[PDB]
């Protein structure tokens, strides 16, 4: 019966957070209740926000919330603008979205990404070989964390090599993939570009649709560069973590998933969803048309799902984190990201004698005015 007053609209200004420190404003919101309302720097008005693990899964996996409708107005957001108007996989719903994700799904499953494990391991060794030959002072990001993800995706996409330059500038290729995809599009290849090529041939997807997806995947590696950057900043600044991984290599896969759960991958929240019809969440009525954001970072610190949520526990048993999202729009690169992280931890922790930061932890530069958090550089040193 009794009316439940709507939450006050909380303003969430863009703030550059140090290292991997948690956003105090998000903490405030997490403590206010499961359903809040926020207003970000750009776009207009307010949007709902859910922070609990169960509500985050509900909103991201329920058909009643859509992505296409976000383009119908200026939904309050962190990013200055929403250039990927239409066509981008993130802004598509079940009909078109499903066709697009299905065309390449097989290459990104656990078994799919295992295809490039061997070659990727070798590619990483060449990068580490070079860093070691050059001598101790090194920016781990520039020498390994940045180039490795790019090399890996090229192998998975089924592209030869030199596409990196364009990738770094993206900080051209649209035309490149248009060629490869639309000029080979029917081979039974297993690589991503072949799969897309084939799909386009079977009228499953459009050439433009295929190119757009190809571009997102090709440059999605920076996410691993930034995230793994935080992983190593943590492993080096907190030696007990690195020493446990050197002491018990068997725990590396689980440790990596725990690091992925904890690391605050982005600033604020990303892309909202629109309630296509009225929806009830924890006694709150979300009206059709309202925007609803989910915070995967907050969800990953849910005290019920992850007891002692702020502690990094490599032995954490049930670890259903949502760092790669949830629902239909869940990250296609999640399995590939775990593979890259696994190879990186192996190489960095086993092949660099006496590895440590070349500066105080607080002196490592992190990206400012960014959407995805991470170091701009990670200076390290070791015994030559
Ligand atoms: C540890 C590194 C990564 C993290 C933490 C991460 C995280 C995320 C998250 C949280 C989303 C949003 C899900 C949503 O909309 O609810 C997402 C989407 C996406 N990610 Fe990643 N990602 C990572 C690496 C990658 C890589 C390497 C690629 C490229 C192979 C990639 C490609 C994508 C794409 C294409 C989407 C959009 C999916 C869709 O809307 O259907 N991600 N990612
Ligand atoms: N504030 C960090 C600066 C560290 N400078 C270290 C010079 C020594 C390099 N050898 C490191 C091997 C570790 N046992």
UniProtKB/Swiss-Prot annotation:
Pfam families, sorted: p450 (PF00067)
Record-linked CDD domains: Cyp158A-like
Cofactor or coenzyme needed: heme
Database matches in SUPFAM superfamilies: Cytochrome P450
Binding site for flaviolin 2: 266
InterPro entries per UniProt: Cyt_P450, Cyt_P450_B, Cyt_P450_CS, Cyt_P450_sf
Domain of life: Bacteria
EC number: 1.14.19.69
Keywords: Heme, Iron, Metal-binding, Monooxygenase, Oxidoreductase
Positions with a binding annotation for heme: 331
Site keyed Involved in determining product regiospecificity: positions: 83
Family: Belongs to the cytochrome P450 family.
Protein name, per record: Biflaviolin synthase CYP158A2
Originating species: Streptomyces coelicolor (strain ATCC BAA-471 / A3(2) / M145)
Gene giving rise to this polypeptide: cyp158a2
